Every structure is written in structure tokens, then in C-alpha cells.
Design a protein around this ligand. Sequence first.
Ligand SMILES: Nc1ncnc2c1ncn2[C@@H]1O[C@H](CSCC[C@H](N)C(=O)O)[C@@H](O)[C@H]1O
Ligand SMILES: [Zn+2]
Ligand SMILES: [Zn+2]
Ligand SMILES: [Zn+2]
Ligand SMILES: [Zn+2]
Lengths: 7, 266
Amino acid sequence: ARKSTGG
Amino acid sequence: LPISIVNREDDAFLNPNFRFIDHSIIGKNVPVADQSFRVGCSCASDEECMYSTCQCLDEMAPDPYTRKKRFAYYSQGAKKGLLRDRVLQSQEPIYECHQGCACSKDCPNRVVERGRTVPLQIFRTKDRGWGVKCPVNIKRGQFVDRYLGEIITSEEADRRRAESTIARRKDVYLFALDKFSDPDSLDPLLAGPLEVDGEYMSGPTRFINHSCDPNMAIFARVGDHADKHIHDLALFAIKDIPKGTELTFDYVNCLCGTAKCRGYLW
Ligand SMILES: Nc1ncnc2c1ncn2[C@@H]1O[C@H](CSCC[C@H](N)C(=O)O)[C@@H](O)[C@H]1O
Ligand SMILES: [Zn+2]
Ligand SMILES: [Zn+2]
Ligand SMILES: [Zn+2]
Ligand SMILES: [Zn+2]
């Protein structure tokens, strides 16, 4: 997978 | 501000191929807007870049105016230079200054810019492999370090994600620069979503383990204002942290003790 930043 | 590695009881060591870098590195198929539309602030101074007069915080909304302070960091308490609580809880991008403004090194709104100010120590936990802990206290709101690596595009990533996720190592190290998406748507210029990968090049934060009740969180730090599709990834302490406690953060926001454990990661 991958690291993220959303909300 | 030295990195130290410690491994008690394992025979593992850092791969001789891994490399430590101070600044991220762009891959070749990624964007670099013209130095022709770059804007910093003329302030004189120182600054006095803590008030709305500075063009660096336009997008930052408010015998008659206021003529109040607004730059997302505290200006004078024992918490000076620490992330405002308004920004912690509210997770709005941090608009910081850069090499385009008429302000210098201490410009109160250039924290992430200055880089890490606390010494870190990688140590070998037992279950989750390597992990990170700090040899000195870290008050909540504090800036630990930022996530680095090699900036790339969604397609080339798709390339590695599967080429890897299929035949070998699962250890994922790709962070997506998506605060703005988606727104625007358409275409413008031329053409009608590119990422940062630090498997073979990165900073200490490359070793922080995921948790479901993290003591740290990541925020986007923006500068040029054209350089925002490739925004910095800042790791801020969301709560006070004793020494020797393993830095953690939710990879999206599993062997984590966390009673609130969301099942798995990602
Ligand atoms: N909460 C968690 N649960 C399971 N695996 C985790 C985890 N946090 C980190 N990892 C591991 O770490 C990888 C991402 S990067 C973490 C660095 C790793 N500890 C190292 O020694 O290089 C994940 O793919 C997984 O293999
Ligand atoms: Zn400034
Ligand atoms: Zn300014
Ligand atoms: Zn500025
Ligand atoms: Zn968990």
C-alpha cells in the first residue's frame, strides 16, 4: 500500500 | 541532532544500500513551475510574518482590521514555535515562508523549513522491526522531522507497488502527497496524484511505526505556493511525548497495542 493524508 | 542506531538482541543492521538524505529528491517526470511565477513575502524587518498582512497566508482562511496573529504557530508562551492548537485539531495545510520572502532564518513561520531540531535514535523493537524513539522530551505540537524520499508520479509508483507487492517484500514506504486533490479536473499547460517513496533513501522518519492511537500526525507544509502539488510532509507531535517512547502515526490517519486498533494498516 501507501502512506496518505486525506481527512 | 545526530541519528544513532541501536539494536538490542537482533542480528539485523541497516541495509548497506539504504542512504540518509537531508532533502527530498525529485524524479525526472515531475513538475517544477517557472521561477517566473514565484512569490514570497516582501515583509520587512526581522519579520512579521505572523499576521494576515503577509501574502504567504492568503489561502489560510481566518479600528476595523483585526490585525491578529494567524501563522499556525505560537508566538510567545512556553509553547512558542509549537503548532497552534487550532491547526493541530483542524488539520489545515501549514503555509510557511521560504527563499522567496524578505524575511530570515527565524521567521516565526518557517519552522518546518529549518528542519529537525531534536535528536532521534533508531532502535530495534522486537515485533515491528525498527522503530523510532527520541532521547529528549517532545511537547505536543512540536515538529519532529519530515518525511523524505524520492518524489515520483502515480504511474511509476503503480510500477513499483505491484512489481514489489507481487513477487517480494511488502514493506511499503510510499507516502502520497495528496492534501490537495480532485479539483482543477482538466488539462492546463501540457498534461491532462504523485507520491514520495523512501525505501532506498530517506530520513529517520522512514522508520516510524504505524499506530491506531498515534502520538504524532502528519501535516502538509507549503511554500512557493506553486510548489504545492509536491508539498513537504511534516511530522508533528500531537501530544506530549516522554523520552524513550516510540514515535508513531496512523499511515492513513497491525501490531499496535492501541486498544482502538483499526484492524490492519492502510
Ligand atoms: N502498525 C504496523 N503494523 C504492521 N506492520 C507495520 C506497522 N508499522 C510499520 N509496519 C511495517 O513497516 C512497513 C512500513 S515502513 C516501517 C519501517 C520498518 N519498521 C523498518 O524496519 O524499515 C510496513 O509495510 C510494515 O512492514
Ligand atoms: Zn516570513
Ligand atoms: Zn511575511
Ligand atoms: Zn513569506
Ligand atoms: Zn493498530
